[PDB]
């Protein structure tokens, strides 16, 4: 029962991810609120690219009166709860002054929670082996995004008043908090010196960001693309295209976990993540397709499947890069580089979805990152050595 703790706490650090991301865009795209500004909510998670600049300051000192007299997952999760609940309670489309009143605060709190959830509890009490112990968290997180996001809006759409859905989420945090009660000045810079001390620091830096650049386009404006001027025709039916792909990706990752051990060809990443582009064509093939009966359901279960499989492979390679004394203090840096592409991709993608429509944005712009996989082949000269 040692691992049973992680999953429950996973939902604490997996829920707030979608409330400023896909569900905020679905909530704005259900109203008119233009088209460009729906994607202008991508700089909200700017806190997920500066999280390493203050990763060590939060911990270490933790004076008892300020913090540590109760676990810090509480000192982040309770504060997060008020901000999330107040986010939706404000004006839906009349006065949008909340664009930053509760978007930046939510991202700040989440980025402050995932850091303390990877530092003070992950490697301090892992019981040595961290492979399966950490593989359980990915599942206690994927499932948190499944609870929110697509399936979450299924009841919100039927129910009258989107603020009620927020009360569901603020109420889904109550079990977290209750199951958790029973579950340095120079610190900022001294770590960073070991990341650029390699030959291949800049090459790995570029590879980390450009590899997933393609995978971010296909999850940037899917919510608006389907319901808006497209054969989806609904919003209630959103489970068809916003839930199936989460269960498909979680399952794909689970297959990836056993398969990686089953790896018989050293390619690993190359083959497991090369097809991430041919899977995105599922959307393009539906771009010229009428609403149909099941058409959009063919791609939802296949595209999110391919990237889902490659998820574990990415994270696992990202973990091996940094397992030294500095520990997760430096891991968080590689987790700031992974979200840079998907945080800033919105406005740029939208500008391209304005001039040349949707289709050619799915064909060329999406496949821009397939060459990056080709570049990974060169990067396999130094990666193979280790
Ligand atoms: C260990 C961990 O929590 N990593 C990050 C998490 O990524 C997860 C990521 O989920 C993505 C967003 C998703 O599938 O929607 C998944 N993929 C990668 C590459 O990180 C995987 O799931 C747990 C962790 O790793 O998300 C945020 C990144 O900005 C951050 O809160 C957090 O650093």
């Amino acid at each position: 029962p040692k691992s049973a703790i992680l999953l429950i706490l996973g939902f604490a650090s997996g829920l707030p991810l979608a409330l400023t991301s896909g569900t905020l865009q679905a909530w704005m795209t259900v109203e008119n609120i233009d088209l460009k500004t729906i994607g202008f909510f991508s700089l909200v998670g700017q806190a997920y690219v500066f999280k390493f600049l203050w990763s060590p300051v939060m911990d270490r000192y933790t004076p008892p009166f300020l913090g540590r007299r109760r676990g810090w997952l509480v000192t982040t999760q309770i504060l997060l709860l008020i901000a999330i609940a107040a986010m939706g309670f404000l004006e839906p489309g009349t006065q949008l002054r909340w664009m930053a009143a509760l978007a930046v605060v939510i991202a700040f709190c989440s980025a402050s929670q995932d850091i303390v959830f990877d530092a003070w509890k992950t490697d301090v009490l892992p019981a040595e082996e961290r492979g399966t112990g950490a593989a359980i968290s990915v599942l206690g997180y994927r499932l948190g995004m499944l609870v929110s996001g697509g399936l979450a809006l299924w009841m919100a759409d039927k129910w009258l008043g989107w603020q009620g859905m927020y009360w569901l989420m603020a109420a889904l945090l109550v079990p977290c908090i209750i199951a958790t009660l029973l579950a340095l000045e120079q610190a900022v810079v001294a770590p960073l010196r070991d990341f650029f001390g390699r030959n291949n620091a800049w090459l790995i830096l570029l590879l980390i960001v450009l590899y997933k650049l393609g995978d971010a386009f296909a999850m940037s404006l899917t919510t608006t693309f389907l319901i808006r001027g497209v054969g989806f025709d609904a919003g209630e039916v959103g489970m068809v295209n916003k839930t199936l792909g989460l269960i498909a990706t979680i399952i794909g990752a689970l297959y990836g976990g056993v398969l990686m051990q089953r790896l018989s060809l050293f390619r690993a990443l190359l083959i497991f993540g090369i097809l991430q582009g041919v899977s995105n064509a599922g959307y393009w093939l539906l771009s010229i397709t009428d609403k149909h009966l099941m058409s959009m359901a063919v791609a939802v279960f296949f595209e999110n499947l391919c990237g889902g499989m490659g998820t574990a492979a990415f994270v696992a390679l990202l973990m091996t890069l940094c397992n030294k004394s500095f520990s997760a203090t430096q891991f968080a840096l590689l987790s700031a580089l992974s979200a840079v592409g998907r945080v800033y991709v919105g406005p740029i993608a939208g500008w391209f979805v304005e001039a040349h429509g949707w289709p050619t944005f799915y064909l060329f712009s999406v496949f821009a990152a397939v060459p990056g996989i080709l570049l990974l082949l060169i990067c396999r000269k130094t990666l193979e050595y280790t």
Side-chain angles (χ1 to χ4, degrees), residues 17 48 51 114 118 138 141-142 145 311 314-315 331 335 338-339 342:
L17 189 99
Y48 295 4
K51 86 202 280 193
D114 92 291
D118 218 298
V138 175
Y141 168 101
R142 201 56 23 60
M145 321 188 295
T311 304
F314 186 79
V315 62
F331 183 91
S335 295
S338 61
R342 183 254 295 113

Side-chain angles (χ1 to χ4, degrees), residues 23-322:
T23 78
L24 207 69
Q25 270 196 3
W27 179 41
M28 197 171 299
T29 206
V30 84
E31 314 295 8
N32 310 15
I33 322 300
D34 289 345
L35 70 95
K36 304 191 51 43
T37 179
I38 326 166
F40 283 177
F41 276 10
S42 239
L43 299 301
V44 316
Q46 73 175 357
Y48 295 4
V49 293
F50 319 121
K51 86 202 280 193
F52 66 90
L53 242 191
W54 63 278
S55 211
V57 300
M58 174 141 202
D59 295 298
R60 293 182 183 174
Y61 178 16
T62 71
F65 60 103
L66 297 194
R68 200 167 38 61
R69 263 171 197 183
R70 277 308 325 296
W72 277 60
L73 298 159
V74 175
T75 204
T76 65
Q77 189 185 145
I78 298 288
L79 316 192
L80 190 138
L81 192 164
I82 196 62
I84 55 175
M87 186 159 206
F89 178 84
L90 295 197
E91 338 304 356
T94 305
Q95 336 182 0
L96 302 84
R97 209 162 172 166
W98 58 273
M99 332 167 209
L102 285 313
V104 305
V105 177
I106 263 61
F108 189 126
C109 202
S110 295
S112 97
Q113 188 181 185
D114 92 291
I115 169 60
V116 179
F117 179 70
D118 218 298
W120 179 77
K121 190 62 58 62
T122 286
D123 291 70
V124 175
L125 292 133
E128 185 176 0
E129 321 161 9
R130 198 75 199 109
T132 301
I136 191 66
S137 97
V138 175
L139 270 275
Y141 168 101
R142 201 56 23 60
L143 193 54
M145 321 188 295
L146 182 162
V147 179
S148 181
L151 197 280
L153 294 167
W154 167 249
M155 172 36 78
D157 181 61
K158 145 69 185 300
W159 184 243
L160 292 302
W162 298 59
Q163 76 214 356
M165 143 176 163
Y166 293 80
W167 169 230
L168 306 187
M169 304 303 104
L172 295 174
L173 267 282
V174 177
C176 299
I177 285 302
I178 201 170
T180 288
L181 215 30
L182 305 178
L184 72 161
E185 179 183 356
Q186 213 270 332
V188 51
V189 298
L192 285 310
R193 336 301 281 283
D194 272 347
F195 191 40
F196 298 166
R198 293 182 183 174
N199 297 114
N200 47 292
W202 279 291
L203 205 174
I204 202 59
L205 214 31
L206 267 187
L207 165 146
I208 209 51
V209 294
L210 176 60
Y211 182 54
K212 314 318 300 294
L213 166 144
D215 309 70
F217 273 10
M219 230 292 95
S220 177
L221 277 185
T222 300
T223 82
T224 297
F225 154 77
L226 307 174
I227 201 185
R228 198 161 288 241
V230 152
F232 178 80
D233 199 59
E236 198 149 4
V237 183
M239 186 186 320
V240 174
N241 269 69
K242 203 52 179 299
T243 301
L244 280 302
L246 298 184
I247 178 179
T249 188
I250 193 165
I251 290 293
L254 291 161
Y255 300 159
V258 180
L259 186 58
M260 211 175 187
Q261 264 75 341
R262 186 55 181 270
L263 197 59
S264 61
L265 203 67
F266 52 90
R267 312 188 69 90
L269 287 184
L270 275 66
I271 61 171
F272 216 49
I274 182 55
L275 300 185
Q276 67 191 3
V278 300
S279 81
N280 301 129
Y283 299 99
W284 158 67
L285 178 91
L286 301 158
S287 300
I288 294 169
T289 295
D290 296 0
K291 58 183 61 158
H292 217 174
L293 210 171
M294 71 212 210
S295 61
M296 298 185 153
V298 312
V300 63
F301 184 82
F302 281 160
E303 187 284 303
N304 295 270
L305 209 39
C306 178
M309 261 167 288
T311 304
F314 186 79
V315 62
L317 267 290
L318 188 146
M319 203 218 50
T320 188
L321 287 188
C322 180

